[PDB]
Amino acid sequence: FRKMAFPSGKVEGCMVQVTCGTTTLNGLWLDDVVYCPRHVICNCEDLLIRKSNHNFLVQAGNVQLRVIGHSMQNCVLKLKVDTANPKTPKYKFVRIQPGQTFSVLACYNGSPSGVYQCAMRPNFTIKGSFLNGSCGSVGFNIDYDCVSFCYMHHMELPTGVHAGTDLEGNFYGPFVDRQTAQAAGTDTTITVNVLAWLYAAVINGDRWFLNRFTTTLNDFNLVAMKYNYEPLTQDHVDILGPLSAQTGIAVLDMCASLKELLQNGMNGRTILGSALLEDEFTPFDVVRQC
Amino acid sequence: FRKMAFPSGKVEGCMVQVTCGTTTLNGLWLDDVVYCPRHVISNHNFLVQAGNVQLRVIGHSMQNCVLKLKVDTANPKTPKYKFVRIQPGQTFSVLACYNGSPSGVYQCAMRPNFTIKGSFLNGSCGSVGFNIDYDCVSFCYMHHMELPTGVHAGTDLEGNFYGPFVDRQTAQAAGTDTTITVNVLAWLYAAVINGDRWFLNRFTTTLNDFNLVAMKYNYEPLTQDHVDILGPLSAQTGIAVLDMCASLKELLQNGMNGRTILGSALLEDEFTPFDVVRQCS
Ligand SMILES: COc1cccc2[nH]c(C(=O)N[C@@H](CC(C)C)C(=O)N[C@@H](C[C@@H]3CCNC3=O)C(=O)COP(=O)(O)O)cc12
Ligand SMILES: COc1cccc2[nH]c(C(=O)N[C@@H](CC(C)C)C(=O)N[C@@H](C[C@@H]3CCNC3=O)C(=O)COP(=O)(O)O)cc12
């Protein structure tokens, strides 16, 4: 069982470099439009009216695309180009929910650099790996050749976690695209994902945390809230149904295991090679892989 | 620090499926040759497909445990590429594939016992591992087998197994594994780069003395090639390799003491010196 990203090729063929003045970052080229963070032009609406199409330099590899129009949508700039991208996959723009996962394609100067999986934290940050020049890198999921784009990268907080927008330019979380030190809300642990990962552990032969006890949902939620875990809902219990079906361990049975781990710790033991309780795998992530 | 795979697009363009009889696995289509595990078994006995499009086989040969199928079409998506044989401790990206269709990408490290900690199901054989340097893909792994302990084993692209395994339907055991010393050292350099340097001491060691101590803690001995690849990190931090070795020796002999390095009480041994520079630079 491994943290596994989607194959990134359908997205690599869409990455370009956008330059305006002395600022450069990455853009996403779909059909005849390039999407990139509006920070590349740095009130912002007045800054944009003062630019012309020729102020924007867009490169796909070494080929310069010609900008024939421009607009702003929240924190995202949309550059119309006179060339359509033939590598454009079937795609959608989606706004993901906290606790869901996606693949990030880290890019620099329009060149894809690395790929890895992230979860949208409850406090709407992501624990990524991004350096100077990564702005405009995107996050996505792939379902049957359709790429659903959900994240465009903008900033790194003082704590080292990351913040960005959806592809409509609206931030996840209470952040803004300005050069300021910004703190996130208090983070919490994605309970449904921890349980999905414990099921993944049982499917892979790790069973030392299982116990004889069962708990009620409300009693589990009282302990979970005490340890800064998100509440578990009946919908979460349902979503875990297939994993409980495959393992023969009722969901509220697994919750009793989680409660004991939270109250007694792991005593130096590991689960799937981890000394910590992992909450960045969704129930679907476990199913899709196992 | 994240375990980061290389972008997989250059390899995705090369994945095909190879069927002989009822057995289908993945193949790697470079120029006019398709490489796949020989376990898949005349030219017309082989069904090679890119998606649902058949590629006509015009020749075949066997190189160790890999089958080489000559096809009549040169792959237009062929990247600049090399076949390389990696050493234990080196990392690479795996593109997990089923029936010629890529499924996911993740980073693996070759253990000293020549296994990797993969995520592979039935139908994954022929999936490859690779590194990408300046648009050139160095292929280093082709997947063949899951051991009874859940770890995985395979060959290079010349069909030679890493480790003492064979492509038979038989339960095989790896040697007892050890910790990848060169990678732990890279991880300590990464901690120093980020300001976490409590573990630096004022001792040094010889390479040989360190190696003999290391083996008593189930750590790998260092080669001269290991000392060489730590050079860039040593210069960046101004900490000599043998001085860092002396620091690691104290951690082995004295423990963390409820202290952390880069947030964890466990030392990490699956980031190479190149991986550390990749992520810090
Ligand atoms: C006082 O200020 C601060 C204080 C404390 C913490 C702070 N953090 C940020 C920040 O993150 N600022 C954004 C720009 C604003 C306008 C949204 C930025 O720097 N984003 C990077 C990606 C970043 C770069 C390092 N790791 C990444 O993920 C781009 O890629 C674009 O900038 P570049 O042109 O490439 O350098 C400012 C700041
Ligand atoms: C009694 O014998 C055993 C006992 C105990 C443990 C054992 N392990 C193996 C083994 O590993 N067998 C090879 C085939 C040989 C010729 C190398 C295999 O590799 N199976 C998969 C990949 C595997 C399957 C699940 N996860 C993977 O990684 C392929 O992809 C090709 O086989 P398929 O045609 O796709 O099923 C045999 C065996």
Author numbering:
A (entry chain B): 3 to 44, 53 to 300
B (entry chain A): 3 to 43, 62 to 301
What did the article's authors report about this structure?
The main protease (Mpro) of SARS-CoV-2 is a salient enzyme that plays a vital role in viral replication and serves as a fascinating therapeutic target. Mpro is able to cleave the bio-synthesized viral polyprotein 1ab (pp1ab) at 11 specific sites to produce a variety of mature non-structural proteins necessary for viral replication and transcription. Among these, PF-07304814, also named lufotrelvir, is a highly soluble phosphate prodrug of PF-00835231 and a first in class 3CL inhibitor to treat SARS-CoV-2 infection. In the current study, we expressed six Mpro mutants (G15S, K90R, M49I, S46F, V186F, and Y54C) that have been identified in Omicron variants including the recently emerged XBB.1.16 subvariant and solved the crystal structures of PF-07304814 bound to Mpro mutants.
The occurrence rates for G15S, K90R, M49I, S46F, and V186F mutations among 15,476,050 sequenced SARS-CoV-2 Mpro genes in the Global Initiative on Sharing All Influenza Data (GISAID) (accessed on April 27, 2023) are 0.19%, 1.34%, 0.015%, 0.025%, and 0.016%, respectively, while only 13 reports are available regarding the occurrence of Y54C mutation. The prepared samples were successfully crystallized and the crystal structures of PF-07304814 in complex with these Mpro mutants were solved to 2.29-Å (G15S), 1.95-Å (S46F), 2.05-Å (M49I), 1.75-Å (Y54C), 1.97-Å (K90R), and 1.70-Å (V186F) resolution, respectively. Two of these mutations (G15S and K90R) are distal to the substrate binding site of SARS-CoV-2 Mpro, while the other four mutations (M49I, S46F, V186F, and Y54C) are located in or nearby the substrate binding site. However, the electron densities for mutant residues S46F and Y54C could only be traced in one protomer of the Mpro. Though four other substitutions, namely S46F, M49I, Y54C, and V186F, situated nearby the binding site of PF-07304814, no significant changes were found in the orientation of PF-07304814. The P2 NH forms a hydrogen-bonding interaction with the side chain of Gln189 in wild-type and mutant Mpros (except Y54C). In Mpro Y54C-PF-07304814 complex, the hydrogen bond between the Gln189 of mutant Mpro and the inhibitor can not be observed. Gln189 of SARS-CoV-2 Mpro has also been identified as one of the hot spot residues in the interaction with inhibitors and a hydrogen bonding with Gln189 may enhance the potency of Mpro inhibitor. The binding energy values between PF-07304814 and these Mpro mutants are − 8.9 (V186F), -7.4 (G15S), -7.4 (K90R), -6.8 (S46F), -6.6 (Y54C), and − 6.3 (M49I) kcal/mol. Specially, the binding between PF-07304814 and Y54C mutant is much higher than that between PF-07304814 and wild-type Mpro, which may be due to the lost of hydrogen bonding interaction between the Gln189 in Mpro Y54C and the ligand PF-07304814.
